[PDB]
From a paper:
Finally, we wanted to determine the effect of UVC irradiation at resolutions similar to X-ray crystallography, which allow the visualization of individual amino acids. To do this, we used the protein complex, apoferritin (ApoF). Using the same UVC exposure time as ICP1, grids containing apoferritin were treated with UVC for 60 s on the carbon side and 30 s on the copper side. These grids were subsequently imaged and the data processed using SPA. The UVC-treated ApoF sample resulted in a 2.1 Å structure indistinguishable from an untreated published map. A comparison of the map resulting from a UVC-treated apoferritin sample with untreated, published maps found no difference between the two structures (EMD-3853, PDB5N2717). At resolutions of better than 3 Å, structural damage would likely be visible by the lack of disulfide bonds and damage to aromatic amino acids. Our experiments show that UVC irradiation had no impact on our ability to obtain a final structure of ApoF at a resolution of 2.1 Å. This resolution is comparable to other reported structures (EMD-3853, PDB5N2717). While there are no noticeable structural differences in the samples used in this study, it is important to note that undetected damage could be possible, and that this proof-of-concept study does not guarantee that all proteins will behave similarly.
Additionally, we applied the UVC irradiation to the protein apoferritin (ApoF), which is a widely used test sample for high-resolution SPA studies. ApoF is commonly used in EM facilities to determine the performance of microscopes and it has been well characterized by the scientific community using cryo-EM and x-ray diffraction. ApoF is a common validation standard used in the EM community and resolutions of better than 3 Å are routinely achieved.
Author numbering:
A (entry chain O), B (entry chain Q), C (entry chain A), D (entry chain J), E (entry chain W), F (entry chain E): 6 to 179
The structure:
Amino acid sequence: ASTSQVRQNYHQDSEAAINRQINLELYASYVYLSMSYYFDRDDVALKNFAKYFLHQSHEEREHAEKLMKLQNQRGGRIFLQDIKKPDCDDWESGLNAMECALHLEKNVNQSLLELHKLATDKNDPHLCDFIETHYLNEQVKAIKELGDHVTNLRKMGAPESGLAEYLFDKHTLG
Amino acid sequence: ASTSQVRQNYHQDSEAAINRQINLELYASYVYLSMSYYFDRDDVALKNFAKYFLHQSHEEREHAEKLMKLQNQRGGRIFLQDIKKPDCDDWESGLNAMECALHLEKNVNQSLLELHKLATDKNDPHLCDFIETHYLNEQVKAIKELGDHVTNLRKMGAPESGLAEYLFDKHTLG
Amino acid sequence: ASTSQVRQNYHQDSEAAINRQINLELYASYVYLSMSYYFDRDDVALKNFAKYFLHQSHEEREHAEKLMKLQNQRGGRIFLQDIKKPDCDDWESGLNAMECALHLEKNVNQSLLELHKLATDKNDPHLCDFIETHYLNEQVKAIKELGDHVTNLRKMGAPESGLAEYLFDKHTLG
Amino acid sequence: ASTSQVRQNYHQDSEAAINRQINLELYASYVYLSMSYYFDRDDVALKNFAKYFLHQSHEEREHAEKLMKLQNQRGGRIFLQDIKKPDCDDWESGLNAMECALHLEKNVNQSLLELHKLATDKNDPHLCDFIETHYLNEQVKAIKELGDHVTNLRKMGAPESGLAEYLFDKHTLG
Amino acid sequence: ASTSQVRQNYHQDSEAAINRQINLELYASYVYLSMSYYFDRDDVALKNFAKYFLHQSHEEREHAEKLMKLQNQRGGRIFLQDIKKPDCDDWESGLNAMECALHLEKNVNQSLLELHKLATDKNDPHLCDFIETHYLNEQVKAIKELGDHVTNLRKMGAPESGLAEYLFDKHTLG
Amino acid sequence: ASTSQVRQNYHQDSEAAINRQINLELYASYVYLSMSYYFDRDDVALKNFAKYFLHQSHEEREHAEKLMKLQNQRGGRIFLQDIKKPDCDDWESGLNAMECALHLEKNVNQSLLELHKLATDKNDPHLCDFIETHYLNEQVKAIKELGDHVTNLRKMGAPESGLAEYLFDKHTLG
Ligand SMILES: [Cl-]
Ligand SMILES: [Cl-]
Ligand SMILES: [Cl-]
Ligand SMILES: [Cl-]
Ligand SMILES: [Cl-]
Ligand SMILES: [Cl-]
Ligand SMILES: [Cl-]
Ligand SMILES: [Cl-]
Ligand SMILES: [Cl-]
Ligand SMILES: [Cl-]
Ligand SMILES: [Cl-]
Ligand SMILES: [Cl-]
Ligand SMILES: [Cl-]
Ligand SMILES: [Cl-]
Ligand SMILES: [Cl-]
Ligand SMILES: [Cl-]
Ligand SMILES: [Cl-]
Ligand SMILES: [Cl-]
Ligand SMILES: [Cl-]
Ligand SMILES: [Cl-]
Ligand SMILES: [Cl-]
Ligand SMILES: [Cl-]
Ligand SMILES: [Cl-]
Ligand SMILES: [Cl-]
Ligand SMILES: [Mg+2]
Ligand SMILES: [Mg+2]
Ligand SMILES: [Mg+2]
Ligand SMILES: [Mg+2]
Ligand SMILES: [Mg+2]
Ligand SMILES: [Mg+2]
Ligand SMILES: [Mg+2]
Ligand SMILES: [Mg+2]
Ligand SMILES: [Mg+2]
Ligand SMILES: [Mg+2]
Ligand SMILES: [Mg+2]
Ligand SMILES: [Mg+2]
Ligand SMILES: [Mg+2]
Ligand SMILES: [Mg+2]
Ligand SMILES: [Mg+2]
Ligand SMILES: [Mg+2]
Ligand SMILES: [Mg+2]
Ligand SMILES: [Mg+2]
Ligand SMILES: [Mg+2]
Ligand SMILES: [Mg+2]
Ligand SMILES: [Mg+2]
Ligand SMILES: [Mg+2]
Ligand SMILES: [Mg+2]
Ligand SMILES: [Mg+2]
Ligand SMILES: [Mg+2]
Ligand SMILES: [Mg+2]
Ligand SMILES: [Mg+2]
Ligand SMILES: [Mg+2]
Ligand SMILES: [Mg+2]
Ligand SMILES: [Mg+2]
Ligand SMILES: [Mg+2]
Ligand SMILES: [Mg+2]
Ligand SMILES: [Mg+2]
Ligand SMILES: [Mg+2]
Ligand SMILES: [Mg+2]
Ligand SMILES: [Mg+2]
Ligand SMILES: [Mg+2]
Ligand SMILES: [Mg+2]
Ligand SMILES: [Mg+2]
Ligand SMILES: [Mg+2]
Ligand SMILES: [Mg+2]
């Protein structure tokens, strides 16, 4: 119960929202992990898709860690939840994985936007700045990159052209 | 259904056991993550406990990844499950965290030993070698290190001596 | 007849099996040699297929040499046999060569697995360790790589697309 | 009585066997020490035989130390015994010393093989791996080297040719 | 049937003769391989004989490869045959191995001379130049070196003097 | 029986005394070896005590070797005896180990002093100089260092303070 000695201008609702966001970032890490190893299957075998999604997975773990650090910086208390498995076991194709990643990042961005709204409603400028500085432009860049990737794959003839996915793997992700 | 072109001498039971082990390693990663940020709380404030457990968390993620790679190398199919949250939100003390980590690593080791027994019963020497080479001695070393740590903390007067935990933090984990 | 001064715990059946395995490795070297120069024909002209299979040929000669060294280390006696010519003179296509290499490596792996079973039945842990350390994971990696290659070529449109085989030659084997 | 906190899957019989093996390695160190200084006598005066056996003596001390470390890693308890003096005070000749070293290393290897059998019967894969990784191939290499040395000395005309032992000292051990 | 686009002034008899020569070079590689590991036996133990013959074995594999490349350069088609095992399993002595190698190289040289005669009869100056440039002087040098070696071993008292073979191993092959 | 060609002014009693001293130095090496691994136990876990005593163990082996060399330099003949196991299996504490080491080094010093008395009574100045130069001041320094260590541990509150032994381990032995 008793307060943290550091706590100031940090609403309990913001504290809870940061714990939800921690879960979401870990969930995103897990989705990209799954995607990565899909492309490492002997019957998929797109090694640069695999590295690309692994890198993205590790990023998301870093995003989670930074929110954990924030929780403590502000005197909130971290409460972890189960990290749900991804929706898919088999991601179908390079294009479909990229489409799923785009939708994931748009979902993560919507959560961060709700979090910023809350921080604004509770007049927490430090939390607003945090989210703006470390998260919002990362999301906009990730979303733009994924859209670019989907566009290229589509134009190249994916998913039906295995050639298209192979060449994208070498030229864009390589 | 149809076979993987790479698959040879890889029993379905071993395939399932590797998927269980993947979950366990990710679970271990999560426990150490939680422990790490506990020591980063302003009311705990043992920064080298925090770094030590973070490093251990990242290790475990690497151990999971290597099993995922193995699954694919052998032509098995990765099936992920929810990563359960840790048993504890509050780890009590440096000593109690170390005790919990020891019990975690002994549990992980017991799983790997059951996995090796299975691999032996199914006459899978490649899988036996894998487990021996990459996992079993890591576990024995981790277990020994954690026991050493618990011993020192106990001898120093933890958990009642906050001095003991502070000085261990600086001299052993620092 | 009279024993080797070094010989210990080395069954005559293991000695014979190692001589068979020596022949098999040299045979594998010969198959890859043949494949290599097929891709060097003026009417095939895929120079990176050619280098890839030449490298694999030299590897296999090294694998044979290490078994010869082992035979002597254990006090067995090397008995060489004719190295049979490969099954094919003309390997048809990049894809078909890769398919044949996959089947070759799976055959070599099955032989090594039978050899390990024998070594296990004769309670020869040094020989078990030898095979595990120097051979079994090499086979699993070779098999996985070849499967990956076959998958890519298939997805790209080989063997009918001469473009697919040309581009694979440059991007994967180059 | 009470258990070690680290102990897992480590049979008391294996614990005792490791203590016996520790004694044997120290015993081997002592035999090579004695051999070394024999060749340093003014009436023997083969300085490279002396260095060769001293190096081998120090190796064996390292092999003992690694088993001591293992005992502790696994939660067993080290119990030392007297290190018996070697069988011989006077080793007769370079050839006879080499012959005695060959028989010593074959004895040490037989002990390690019995130890591996025990570890296998008690389903201790970590201990099996330990012995395989750190000991069995060292023994096979040592045995092969000693056999090679005995062969050369014999072919050269030792022990009757003092010239043979002198020249072996310079060309093989030098 | 249909011609190679590159083929010019390349008689079918020369094409067949190059395929025979390819087999012979691989056969020579195999003889030297066998010789090499004979000297690696614990009861022979002449390590520089072993390295010398291994080097010669690898050379011969290179000589085969260059003929394979030639076949393709000229638009002929490679047809491989079984590589026969060597005549001997046990090479008796350093001197006898050297004598056998001399006879092998003289046989290989006689084949190359017949090949040059054919190339001359078919007015193939490119093939004549090839053989002259890459093969004939190599043979003359190899033959001279082997004769020199046999002479020295004979003068030193081989094969009865094990000392002679030991010292040759160190001073000439070392 | 017959004399060594090198022997001069070297009494048989001195020869025997040097053989006894060789045994004592090896015995000291063994005591420190045992002490070292005691501190490596998971329930003791003082790693710098362990390194300190291991270093001391290796020193003593060097002291033995130098006496063996001396025996031969003077034309005496080395006669080895069993190296007795240490008095203790369990050394109780850092303080008690240090106390036992102090008593060991004082015993070794008393032996060397008796040896010097003998060398003096037999008018062997070379042996007197040997002992003075290589042994007596080493003993005085070792004894002083061990006394210093015991004093510090005692003042710090050992053996009851596990904190004291931990901090000594880091600051003095570290
Ligand atoms: Cl607040
Ligand atoms: Cl609030
Ligand atoms: Cl939950
Ligand atoms: Cl930007
Ligand atoms: Cl299977
Ligand atoms: Cl199955
Ligand atoms: Cl689940
Ligand atoms: Cl280790
Ligand atoms: Cl045997
Ligand atoms: Cl047998
Ligand atoms: Cl045959
Ligand atoms: Cl691997
Ligand atoms: Cl146990
Ligand atoms: Cl037990
Ligand atoms: Cl005893
Ligand atoms: Cl080896
Ligand atoms: Cl023509
Ligand atoms: Cl023609
Ligand atoms: Cl044939
Ligand atoms: Cl010349
Ligand atoms: Cl005298
Ligand atoms: Cl006297
Ligand atoms: Cl005795
Ligand atoms: Cl001083
Ligand atoms: Mg959520
Ligand atoms: Mg891969
Ligand atoms: Mg990202
Ligand atoms: Mg994120
Ligand atoms: Mg669910
Ligand atoms: Mg989706
Ligand atoms: Mg910014
Ligand atoms: Mg589980
Ligand atoms: Mg902090
Ligand atoms: Mg770890
Ligand atoms: Mg793990
Ligand atoms: Mg739950
Ligand atoms: Mg717990
Ligand atoms: Mg290992
Ligand atoms: Mg065969
Ligand atoms: Mg070419
Ligand atoms: Mg290969
Ligand atoms: Mg092979
Ligand atoms: Mg045939
Ligand atoms: Mg085929
Ligand atoms: Mg390995
Ligand atoms: Mg014994
Ligand atoms: Mg000397
Ligand atoms: Mg050795
Ligand atoms: Mg040893
Ligand atoms: Mg006795
Ligand atoms: Mg003997
Ligand atoms: Mg090894
Ligand atoms: Mg022929
Ligand atoms: Mg050798
Ligand atoms: Mg040559
Ligand atoms: Mg040739
Ligand atoms: Mg035949
Ligand atoms: Mg012959
Ligand atoms: Mg020339
Ligand atoms: Mg004594
Ligand atoms: Mg330790
Ligand atoms: Mg000392
Ligand atoms: Mg001493
Ligand atoms: Mg004592
Ligand atoms: Mg002095």
